[PDB]
Ligand binder design. Sequence first.
Ligand code: BCL
Ligand code: BCL
Ligand code: BCL
Ligand SMILES: CC[C@H]1c2cc3[nH]c4c(c3C)C(=O)[C@H](C(=O)OC)c4c3nc(cc4[nH]c(cc(n2)[C@@H]1C)c(C(C)=O)c4C)[C@@H](C)[C@@H]3CCC(=O)OC/C=C(/C)CCC[C@H](C)CCC[C@H](C)CCCC(C)C
Ligand SMILES: CC[C@H]1c2cc3[nH]c4c(c3C)C(=O)[C@H](C(=O)OC)c4c3nc(cc4[nH]c(cc(n2)[C@@H]1C)c(C(C)=O)c4C)[C@@H](C)[C@@H]3CCC(=O)OC/C=C(\C)CCC[C@H](C)CCC[C@H](C)CCCC(C)C
Ligand SMILES: COC(C)(C)C/C=C/C(C)=C/C=C/C(C)=C/C=C/C(C)=C/C=C\C=C(C)\C=C\C=C(C)\C=C\C=C(C)\C=C\CC(C)(C)OC
Ligand SMILES: [Fe+3]
Ligand SMILES: [Mg+2]
Lengths: 274, 45, 45, 46, 46, 46, 46, 46, 46, 46, 48, 47, 318, 278
Amino acid sequence: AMLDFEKKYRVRGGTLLGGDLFDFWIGPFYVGIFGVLTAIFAVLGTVLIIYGASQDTFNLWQISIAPPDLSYGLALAPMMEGGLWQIITVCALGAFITWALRQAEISKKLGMGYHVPVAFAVAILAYATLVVFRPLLMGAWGHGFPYGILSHLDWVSNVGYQYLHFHYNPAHMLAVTFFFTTTLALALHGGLILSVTNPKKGEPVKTAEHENTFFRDVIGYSIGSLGIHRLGLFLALNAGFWSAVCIIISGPFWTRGWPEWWNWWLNVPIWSWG
Amino acid sequence: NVSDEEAKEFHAMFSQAFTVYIGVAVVAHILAWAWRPWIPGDEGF
Amino acid sequence: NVSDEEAKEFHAMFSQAFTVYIGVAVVAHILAWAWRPWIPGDEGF
Amino acid sequence: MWRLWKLYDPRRVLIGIFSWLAVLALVIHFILLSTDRFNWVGGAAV
Amino acid sequence: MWRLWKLYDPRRVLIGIFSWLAVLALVIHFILLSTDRFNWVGGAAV
Amino acid sequence: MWRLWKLYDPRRVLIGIFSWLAVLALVIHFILLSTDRFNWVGGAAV
Amino acid sequence: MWRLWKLYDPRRVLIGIFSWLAVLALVIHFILLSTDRFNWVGGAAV
Amino acid sequence: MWRMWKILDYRRTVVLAHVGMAVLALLIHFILLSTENFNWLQGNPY
Amino acid sequence: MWRMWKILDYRRTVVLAHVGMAVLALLIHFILLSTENFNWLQGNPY
Amino acid sequence: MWRMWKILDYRRTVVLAHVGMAVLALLIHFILLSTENFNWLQGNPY
Amino acid sequence: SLTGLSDEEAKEFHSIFMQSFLIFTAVAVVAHFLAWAWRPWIPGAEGY
Amino acid sequence: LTGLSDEEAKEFHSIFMQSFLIFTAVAVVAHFLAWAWRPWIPGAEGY
Amino acid sequence: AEYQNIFTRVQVRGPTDPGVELPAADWPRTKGATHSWLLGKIGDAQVGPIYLGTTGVMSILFGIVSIVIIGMNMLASVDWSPLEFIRQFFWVALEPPPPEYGLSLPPLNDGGWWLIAGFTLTLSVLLWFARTYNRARALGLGTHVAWAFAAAIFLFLAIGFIWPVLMGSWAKSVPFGIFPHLDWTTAFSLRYGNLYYNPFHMLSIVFLFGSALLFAMHGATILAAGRYNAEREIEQITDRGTAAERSALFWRWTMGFNATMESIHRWGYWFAILCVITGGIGILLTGTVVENWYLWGVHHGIAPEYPEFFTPAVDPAA
Amino acid sequence: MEGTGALTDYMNVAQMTLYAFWLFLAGLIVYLRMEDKREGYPLQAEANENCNRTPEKKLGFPAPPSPKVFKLADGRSIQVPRAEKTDYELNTQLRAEPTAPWDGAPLEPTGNPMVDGLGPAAWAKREDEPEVTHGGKQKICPLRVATEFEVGMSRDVARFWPEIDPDPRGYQVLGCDGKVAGKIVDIWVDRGELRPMYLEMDLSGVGSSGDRVLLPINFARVGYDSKVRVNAITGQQFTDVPRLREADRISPQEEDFITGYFGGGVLYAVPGRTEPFL
Ligand code: BCL
Ligand code: BCL
Ligand code: BCL
Ligand SMILES: CC[C@H]1c2cc3[nH]c4c(c3C)C(=O)[C@H](C(=O)OC)c4c3nc(cc4[nH]c(cc(n2)[C@@H]1C)c(C(C)=O)c4C)[C@@H](C)[C@@H]3CCC(=O)OC/C=C(/C)CCC[C@H](C)CCC[C@H](C)CCCC(C)C
Ligand SMILES: CC[C@H]1c2cc3[nH]c4c(c3C)C(=O)[C@H](C(=O)OC)c4c3nc(cc4[nH]c(cc(n2)[C@@H]1C)c(C(C)=O)c4C)[C@@H](C)[C@@H]3CCC(=O)OC/C=C(\C)CCC[C@H](C)CCC[C@H](C)CCCC(C)C
Ligand SMILES: COC(C)(C)C/C=C/C(C)=C/C=C/C(C)=C/C=C/C(C)=C/C=C\C=C(C)\C=C\C=C(C)\C=C\C=C(C)\C=C\CC(C)(C)OC
Ligand SMILES: [Fe+3]
Ligand SMILES: [Mg+2]
């Protein structure tokens, strides 16, 4: 089934691989070659996760596929000692990368720019930082995070407290600022569009004049219809990127407590006062 | 909608697959029961 | 759309490449088995 | 039972069947690599 | 060098110079206050 | 086998093959470095 | 008092009052469960 | 019960039957591999 | 079976075959490097 | 009281009543399962 | 019909499909016979 | 199918009630077997 | 080589937009409005004018009083040194009352200044809420922005007022400092046993991460469909252009389901405000009805169990 | 357990608060998915998707809400989903043939997909009345009538660093194949959005110098060397860009015609764009 306007858009072309062979839709999903791959990768990784779950516990929150011991270095591990995690990592990476390449096939077919696959490549960059880049720099795949709903929260807790106060990480304070600011911007953007198209009952749908006037009335500046989506993309992508920066520098480029990092600020010759 | 003849051809294909699938399932469970019965007694297995 | 002639030409190139790839791969496994067989015995290797 | 192909395009069922076989073969081969008895390259004893 | 002002707008050059001079004199005065030897109001001895 | 180049743009094949060679060669060298026998710069002994 | 229903939509007020009644009943029942004296499932002795 | 196909589309039902029984059968086989008496790969005593 | 190419486009299948078999070949080689008895670089006794 | 269906949709209310009573039936059973005097699966002394 | 296959095309694809399926299954049957001779996978009552 | 008539609604209803009766009947037997295995209503002492 | 809709290449400047006419009781807007080339690259170039009414002025006055109290106490803590103020800028704070005062009014230098700063800050944000509400109503807009702001207010009040009041001490509240309120955030989690196991903190993060996910998805989609004037989203809601169809088709083909030009902003609006609402509820639950969140997670079977890797420590004081 | 918050031997207040939020989150998710189904619904199941070989309508789950009335500024209560757009889409005879009869097969255009509105070249059915501002001015108008706008946000930047504050008037336009299509004569601005939207050009390079054509700004890459490079379409293809009904106004429909035509170039402008990398 299709949206009542969808038929005319379902044309041939836009693929990067596979050509006509996979260029079709199953229900609403466009398939493409990267959809077949993202399906094989996703099913493989999910079924491997459930196998790992069957060996410890089926409780959804307590399922955990953990990375190997640090003593393994970069070697591939036995399956039940983190080798299962490593296969799931290469399956998830492939699932993410083929998902973005597939969104690139969908982008070209609808004549859209590649903003969505690239914006997703930032999210893939952050996961790659967590499971590939940072474990590489530190020298062991065991530095990646476990695949479990509650077991990866203990990883975040302990890795954060490896630096004794992770709030003082300068790149983390920047990434948190970008995360808080982008949901603030999302609240304003979503709210303002709803406020115009859904005014008080008995009022006409308003214009982009009212949108600019509203924020110029409130804060004295309005970024506009186009600016809100550039800034919205900018804030969320910087949120992802500075997440990657904050974690890649935690351990490969800083092994002490993050509060100590601010010792350079306390020592600036301008304001030492002693 | 489908006619009776189309729907009967659907159900002929379904009944063929259903019988093979259930027949293999019945045999498989009879083998699994001969191997290790899965209903515990009052004292376990 | 593809005719039987152009299909057979595609299968012709498939067969030449498949047999060369399969042939060299068979040699690879015979050398690998001559080196260290990968089917463990009752005591392993 | 030939009429199943009056319903499903041969290209799509073959793509789905082969994708299913690829997932299945890897999962079973990997599950055996997880076990101590069937990890053939690991080569445990019985 | 009189032609320098046919290229660069005098107001922007003077604003740029004034901003640099204000920041620089503030930074030098602050750096001196941060040192033990040149803190003139801290009243230390040499 | 010359018919193969009737099927693909030779430029896209040269890009594809040289991309495999570049990544494969780096990985093989890096794996050899990671060993304690074929790490040539580490001065491993045998 | 009947003119209340020419001011507000009867369905809307019915939906809102029932939602308030459902929430209040849930809140009170669990308020009693959290106390010692009025926990009927807990079977606490007074 | 061929009148079932006068209600439910036979194609979409068959696809749904294969995907659902796939996940169900994986689920049950995994449940047995989680146990100690039916994990045929571990081969524990019964 | 030359008829297989009247369903699957041959040009695209060849490309998919190479990328897929590259992944599988790397996967198998990496699996052997993980094992003790078939890590040819580490060379543990057999 | 049949005039109730001239205010709220009968089609909508029937469906939301099944969903609403689904949650309520699930909630009460789960509340009893969270006790000790009424957990029939545990079968604690009463 | 859906998929636009004539009845003869459906019957011809069926025979090749069923042939390819029996050949694929037969090799699996042989591989399982070899796998069973190596290490049986149905434990006895006392385990392995 | 959406606009079923009276005779088609009566015909669907009878088949629905027959399917539900068979589904319930098989389940009832399943519960009679499950009770024979392990009863699930404890006495005051427990199990 | 395609234009990426990241910076506006060609800009056009006209007269300053004075805004839509207000009702004939509102204060006059300010007269100050200028155009910025730098801001015009990202979006609208006009800066100002701004409205200021009763609620706006009183919010600013209450907020300035709060900022002066915090700033002067911050400056006083470093012996009034502006240099030492810059050196310690992230570390200084207006400290909340010590625990011994409970909910009473403590002396100025023992949390009294904190309580006044918290009161005036609360008043300014509440008046700012009324300002956002009235500016929308004055233009005939819905009050969605104000209620989304009210949702952020509730977490702010839950953290600083309601939860400390429910706990019976102003000490539990958060100091006005940069690193100190980060110290409060960490200590809060330490005290009540790993806020990670708080489910409403989990949900809060779900909607926070989903908000960044949504804005990234939506912002990228509007820029990608900018070739079809997607960013003119109001026109697409009332008159579905091809951009609205390509945006919906893109996500329908990707993940199997889509939104509309209007429903995407409902998804993002609810994700933004649910993040801050589950946040407030999670804060109100801890300390009051959950003592230790890890022990709560153990009770409800959500804590992972870890095999032996080390010799477990034993409390000598057991 | 015991303490404040206990509701039973196992249930506590935080847990039941959580399930209370689960019920709300579901009702919100269902509500949000219904708001999702006000454009393009009900789904059009074609005959070749269903075993009965009859076209149908699928509501999906949750089913779409009732129609929604947007009262408009000019005094026109429009209903969503709009009847005229649905009626246009269901009746339009596409100039394309499915590459296969089964459901999900892509359409292959028969004639010229760019002028026929196929795929990335497609347009929606929109209003033919040109948009107005809140005050009644013409919303999208060229700078010759919208004379209160001058090109360039900053006069000093436009005068001393014109590279970053350009004025594309008089610029040469090149297509994806590098050929010269003509000269930019005017810029169209949105009085509400305060942005350029279209670059009107003449066809002095590939057609009549007196002909006028609109180039959407997001398809134009205004360079630093007085050349505007359009990657969407070949220079020869600028001649078939749809013309305005009136030389000084554009309806929302013509915006979808013009942006649609350029978007279609992404696949159909030159051979090989449809074809994969490999
Ligand atoms: C005690 C521990 C420390 C701490 C230790 C850490 C550590 C360690 C980390 C963070 C990271 C983060 N911290 Mg911290 N952090 C602390 C307290 C906080 C507080 C707070 C309330 O005080 C906040 C707001 C934050 C905020 C943040 C973010 C900036 C960042 C996580 C976002 C991110 O990485 O996106 C990136 C998003 C992803 C990586 C998701 C990947 C998406 C992929 C590509 C697709 C997946 C698809 C999926 C499988 C689909 C599912 C299937 C379908 C649904 C069917 N932290 C405390 C002080 N923090 C993380 C970070 O920055 O890493 C990059 C990180 O590693
Ligand atoms: C020969 C050509 C095709 C083929 C042609 C056909 C045709 C024609 C038919 C089938 C049908 C079936 N085929 Mg077949 N089938 C083939 C070969 C196989 C093989 C095999 C390995 O050889 C297997 C195992 C199967 C299996 C099946 C079954 C799914 C089904 C018969 C049982 C049934 O009636 O389902 C009944 C079960 C249901 C209706 C419900 C299924 C499960 C639902 C969705 C709910 C369970 C979900 C589950 C609980 C989720 C798990 C929990 C998660 C953790 C959340 N087929 C080949 C590949 N097959 C029949 C069918 O599809 O019936 C409708 C049918 O008509
Ligand atoms: C000058 C000529 C060209 C060339 C011309 C041709 C032509 C013509 C053909 C080939 C074909 C092949 N070529 Mg060649 N080929 C060249 C030289 C090579 C060299 C080499 C080192 O010299 C190699 C190794 C190969 C390799 C191959 C094979 C892929 C293939 C033959 C076997 C087959 O039929 O696969 C088929 C097997 C499959 C398709 C299995 C599919 C595997 C799927 C994708 C598995 C996916 C699951 C995934 C791995 C999961 C990952 C999980 C992990 C944990 C990460 N070619 C040169 C460069 N080659 C043939 C071919 O590709 O036909 C299709 C063919 O017709
Ligand atoms: C970088 C800015 C933010 C962002 C952006 C972003 N995310 C995106 C996109 C964009 C632009 C998409 O276009 C893409 C999309 O299409 O979303 C609908 C996506 C997406 N972001 C998603 C999730 C997601 N994003 C997150 C974060 C973020 N995404 C950032 C905050 C998170 C977090 C913070 O946890 C999650 C969970 C998906 C909904 C979707 C990508 C879907 C995808 O890749 O599907 C591939 C196939 C699968 C079924 C995935 C599973 C396959 C694996 C083999 C199994 C699972 C392995 C995994 C390691 C398990 C880990 C579990 C434990 C951590 C519990
Ligand atoms: C959905 C939840 C998210 C959210 C939403 C949200 N926030 C909001 C809103 C919304 C919907 C608003 O409408 C409102 C707003 O104004 O948005 C622009 C706001 C807002 N969120 C803000 C901050 C904020 N939001 C945050 C978070 C969040 N906001 C959540 C993540 C945070 C974080 C992460 O901690 C912060 C810090 C404000 C910028 C703004 C409300 C401002 C406010 O209440 O101000 C009160 C008044 C004062 C502080 C007075 C002092 C201000 C000046 C110093 C006065 C100047 C005096 C004079 C005019 C000039 C003097 C100088 C002379 C030399 C000229
Ligand atoms: C000297 O400085 C001058 C004057 C030059 C100006 C400079 C000012 C500066 C630099 C100020 C710097 C300020 C900074 C950096 C502040 C940092 C603030 C931060 C990070 C705050 C973060 C969190 C604080 C919170 C959440 C506070 C919450 C407090 C609340 C919600 C208080 C509520 C209190 C109420 C409602 C009071 C009730 C009083 C009643 C009446 C109930 O008592 C009986
Ligand atoms: Fe938007
Ligand atoms: Mg502190």
